[PDB]
Amino acid sequence: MILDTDYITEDGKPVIRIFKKENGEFKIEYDRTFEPYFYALLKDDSAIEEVKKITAERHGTVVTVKRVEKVQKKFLGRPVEVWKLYFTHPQDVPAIRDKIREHPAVIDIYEYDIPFAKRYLIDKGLVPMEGDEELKMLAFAIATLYHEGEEFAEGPILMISYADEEGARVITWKNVDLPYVDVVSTEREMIKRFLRVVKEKDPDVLITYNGDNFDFAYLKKRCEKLGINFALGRDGSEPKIQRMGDRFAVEVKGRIHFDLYPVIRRTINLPTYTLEAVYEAVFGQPKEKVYAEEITTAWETGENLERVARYSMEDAKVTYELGKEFLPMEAQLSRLIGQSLWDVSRSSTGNLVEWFLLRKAYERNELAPNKPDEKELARRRQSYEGGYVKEPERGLWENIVYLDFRSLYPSIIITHNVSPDTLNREGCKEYDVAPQVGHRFCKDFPGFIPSLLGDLLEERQKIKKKMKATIDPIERKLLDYRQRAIKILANSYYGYYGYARARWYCKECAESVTAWGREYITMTIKEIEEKYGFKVIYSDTDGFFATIPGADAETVKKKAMEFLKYINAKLPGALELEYEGFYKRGFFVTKKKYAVIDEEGKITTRGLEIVRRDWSEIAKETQARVLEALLKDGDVEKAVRIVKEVTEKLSKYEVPPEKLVIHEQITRDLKDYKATGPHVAVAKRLAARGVKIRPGTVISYIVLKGSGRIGDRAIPFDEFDPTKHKYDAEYYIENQVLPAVERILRAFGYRKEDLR
DNA sequence: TATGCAACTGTGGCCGTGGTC
DNA sequence: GACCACGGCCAC
Numbered sequence: 001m002i003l004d005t006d007y008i009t010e011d012g013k014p015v016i017r018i019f020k021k022e023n024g025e026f027k028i029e030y031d032r033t034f035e036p037y038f039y040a041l042l043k044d045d046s047a048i049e050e051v052k053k054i055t056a057e058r059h060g061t062v063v064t065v066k067r068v069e070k071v072q073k074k075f076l077g078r079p080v081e082v083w084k085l086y087f088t089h090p091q092d093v094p095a096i097r098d099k100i101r102e103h104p105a106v107i108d109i110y111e112y113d114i115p116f117a118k119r120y121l122i123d124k125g126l127v128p129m130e131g132d133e134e135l136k137m138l139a140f141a142i143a144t145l146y147h148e149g150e151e152f153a154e155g156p157i158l159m160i161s162y163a164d165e166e167g168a169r170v171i172t173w174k175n176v177d178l179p180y181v182d183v184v185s186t187e188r189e190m191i192k193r194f195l196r197v198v199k200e201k202d203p204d205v206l207i208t209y210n211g212d213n214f215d216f217a218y219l220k221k222r223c224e225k226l227g228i229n230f231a232l233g234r235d236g237s238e239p240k241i242q243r244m245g246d247r248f249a250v251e252v253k254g255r256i257h258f259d260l261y262p263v264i265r266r267t268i269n270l271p272t273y274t275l276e277a278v279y280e281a282v283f284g285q286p287k288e289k290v291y292a293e294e295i296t297t298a299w300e301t302g303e304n305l306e307r308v309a310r311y312s313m314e315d316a317k318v319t320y321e322l323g324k325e326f327l328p329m330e331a332q333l334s335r336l337i338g339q340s341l342w343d344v345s346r347s348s349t350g351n352l353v354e355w356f357l358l359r360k361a362y363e364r365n366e367l368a369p370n371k372p373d374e375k376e377l378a379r380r381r382q383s384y385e386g387g388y389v390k391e392p393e394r395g396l397w398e399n400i401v402y403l404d405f406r407s408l409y410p411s412i413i414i415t416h417n418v419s420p421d422t423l424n425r426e427g428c429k430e431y432d433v434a435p436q437v438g439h440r441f442c443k444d445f446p447g448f449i450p451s452l453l454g455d456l457l458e459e460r461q462k463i464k465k466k467m468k469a470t471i472d473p474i475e476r477k478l479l480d481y482r483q484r485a486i487k488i489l490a491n492s493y494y495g496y497y498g499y500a501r502a503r504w505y506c507k508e509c510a511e512s513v514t515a516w517g518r519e520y521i522t523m524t525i526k527e528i529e530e531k532y533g534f535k536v537i538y539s540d541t542d543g544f545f546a547t548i549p550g551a552d553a554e555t556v557k558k559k560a561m562e563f564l565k566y567i568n569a570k571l572p573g574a575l576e577l578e579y580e581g582f583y584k585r586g587f588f589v590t591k592k593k594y595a596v597i598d599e600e601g602k603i604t605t606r607g608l609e610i611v612r613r614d615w616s617e618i619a620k621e622t623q624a625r626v627l628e629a630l631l632k633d634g635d636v637e638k639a640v641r642i643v644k645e646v647t648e649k650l651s652k653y654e655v656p657p658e659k660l661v662i663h664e665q666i667t668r669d670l671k672d673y674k675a676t677g678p679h680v681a682v683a684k685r686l687a688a689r690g691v692k693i694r695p696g697t698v699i700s701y702i703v704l705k706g707s708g709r710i711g712d713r714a715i716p717f718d719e720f721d722p723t724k725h726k727y728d729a730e731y732y733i734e735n736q737v738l739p740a741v742e743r744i745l746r747a748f749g750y751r752k753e754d755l756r
Numbered sequence: 757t758a759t760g761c762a763a764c765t766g767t768g769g770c771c772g773t774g775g776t777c
Numbered sequence: 778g779a780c781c782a783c784g785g786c787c788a789c
């Protein structure tokens with residue numbers, strides 16, 4: 001299989017490198033013949049003689065057109081002949097593309113900003129990660145000597161651990177008497193030993209957890225201090241640390257550096273993304289955490305270094321196990337998109353949409369539209385109407401069915417052929433007309449995007465059918481993550497239409513999808529209520545909760561299935577309402593905030609404070625206990641006792657101050673805020689000390705006893721001292737606990753006074 | 757800023773916070 | 778006290 005591609009330059013000429021693993025052997029294929037190019041549409045074919053003469057310069061070098069070729073293509077499905085302009089080196093294209101666009105005989109130019117090594121995959125029809133080849137994988141981790149107030153990596157790496165199918169080991173330069181610990185003389189020999197291990201094992205994949213942003217950079221600084229050629233690359237190169245906007249990423253040439261952290265952070269919703277928390281969530285088994293401050297004391301004192309080495313060994317071990325489970329999911333994405341796992345595992349959904357479209361366009365002989373210029377961008381800043389959200393019938397409900405459209409917006413796109421190559425296209429026999437916004441879509445031929453979505457949705461549904469019939473709970477969870485990844489990808493084709501930077505931008509298509517969605521969901525609601533005597537309790541965009549008031553569970557379930565048969569026969573094309581579940585009880589607080597309990601006692605909560613990372617633990621804990629008392633038991637009196645226990649304890653300062661921390665992310669430079677909330681107030685004070693606040697910095701603060709603005713008396717929790725600071729019990733009662741639970745316990749007649 | 761030097765699919769909604777009047 | 782923009786996070 002193909003692992004990756006890049007290109008280097010030799011004597012001015014590009015050379016594509018294809019990193020392969022075939023029949024158990026690593027290979028680099030060199031392609032010295034593939035040429036960069038872009039396309040020009042000319043006012044007349046005679047003008048090619050001038051265009052071929054155009055020259056530019058780049059750093060001393062004269063840039064010329066190498067050769068040209070007339071080709072017949074389509075643009076949004078309409079046939080057109082263009083000239084394919086070939087050049088000697090990819091960097092010729094930026095240097096000359098504008099001088100060609102500006103030539104008076106050139107109408108427009110296309111496909112002039114495509115990364116060369118990825119262009120190569122598309123045009124050659126090559127897909128990374130195909131085949132039955134078994135890849136060799138190795139995970140690693142490091143333990144470091146940390147002291148507060150030091151520059152990054154000023155202290156040495158203490159241990160390097162690594163794990164694979166054969167087991168896990170730790171390399172260190174202090175004597176530790178564990179069987180899996182290899183002792184060497186110095187930090188330098190440790191690093192060199194690890195380098196030797198990687199070269200001997202020769203893994204196809206190197207697995208880290210946040211190695212993109214810590215492990216490799218730490219190793220780099222140390223290797224700069226120590227004079228080490230850290231030649232992990234299969235071509236003898238060192239890890240390449242690249243900046244991609246606000247964070248970094250690391251390549252090891254000839255291998256795939258698989259950093260789990262961006263994958264997990266995108267797939268699993270967790271309050272914290274420690275390795276321990278991620279391991280427990282996936283496997284159900286605990287992992288002890290040894291903190292940076294314990295690591296340093298153990299090393300300086302020499303006492304209890306076994307515990308550090310075990311912790312280091314386990315980091316590698318679980319990093320490996322996690323990588324074993326998540327690499328196959330990302331490898332499927334890599335094949336679906338047609339790009340390397342390194343890139344696919346680190347990209348936003350929209351970037352994957354566009355790489356997929358660019359490949360499908362190439363296969364269909366469709367020119368890509370260009371990205372917008374600054375003027376076109378500014379023209380694309382208007383919004384448009386989205387999904388319909390019904391105000392809920394607040395309160396407790398019983399015997400509730402949840403019905404929900406399968407992949408609604410993609411299904412609309414498929415059914416109504418919604419696409420920029422079919423919008424208001426004149427001369428067709430057949431059109432579908434979007435409600436409210438009126439855009440007309442030709443139905444006589446499949447639009448480009450509509451014709452691609454069907455295979456995605458069909459693949460998702462297969463994964464789902466397998467997932468629901470899977471006994472192993474871990475394999476089922478991984479199948480869930482996989483079918484969810486395709487759901488988000490397919491919906492991102494819709495969002496792409498309304499995405500200002502998209503090539504296949506189509507705001508008319510975007511708002512037609514949403515308009516059809518609004519029409520379908522409201523039609524389904526009117527139908528189930530009028531023809532089946534259901535009451536719709538709550539509805540959001542394409543699904544709703546309903547019951548038959550007075551009816552038992554058996555009856556509600558029977559009639560719901562009858563409705564589905566009826567309504568799915570009326571719906572067109574790919575549109576399908578699905579039975580998503582039954583809930584014996586449910587509590588609806590507001591739009592987007594509710595909780596339901598299934599017939600097995602499992603509670604699911606949406607939007608409520610329990611699921612919010614920026615509410616205090618004590619508030620979330622209390623609300624969770626309340627909802628369990630209400631929905632699982634029938635004990636409203638117990639729910640209130642819980643609340644009073646909490647307000648009493650908080651008053652008596654019996655609640656552990658750790659449950660009172662508020663976490664809120666900084667999203668911009670501190671100068672760009674217009675209002676200063678508590679987390680910005682704390683962040684500005686930390687900046688004044690020189691701490692360095694960035695977008696993505698999380699402020700974890702606690703509110704101290706006082707009366708004025710909350711940000712005036714808010715401190716970071718790492719500065720809290722119970723011997724000096726009293727937390728603001730009245731604030732956590734009146735501003736965290738009571739608000740979250742009172743919104744539920746109103747429905748039973750409980751005022752705030754009845755709970756404190 | 758990646759031989760990918762700008763910045764990461766879309767809209768709807770709650771609600772504490774700190775302003776205004 | 779009534780009201781309102783902001784901001785962060787969340788549900789689709």
Ligand SMILES: Nc1ncnc2c1ncn2[C@H]1C[C@H](O)[C@@H](COP(=O)(O)OP(=O)(O)OP(=O)(O)O)O1
Nearest residue numbers: 404405406407408409410487491495541542766789
């Ligand atoms: N991440 C998203 N990006 C864009 N649009 C979205 C996103 N999530 C939801 N929507 C839109 C498109 C969805 O089709 C629609 C309804 O959401 P939802 O029911 O969650 O998903 P779905 O109908 O695509 O999948 P499912 O088959 O799991 O119901 O709202």
Ligand SMILES: [Mg+2]
Nearest residue numbers: 005006251342
């Ligand atoms: Mg690459």
Ligand SMILES: [Mg+2]
Nearest residue numbers: 404405542543
């Ligand atoms: Mg839905």
Ligand SMILES: [Mn+2]
Nearest residue numbers: 404405406580
């Ligand atoms: Mn659904």
Ligand SMILES: [Mn+2]
Nearest residue numbers: 404405406407
């Ligand atoms: Mn749906």
Ligand SMILES: [Mn+2]
Nearest residue numbers: 614664677772
């Ligand atoms: Mn807040």
Ligand SMILES: [Mn+2]
Nearest residue numbers: 782783784785
């Ligand atoms: Mn806002």
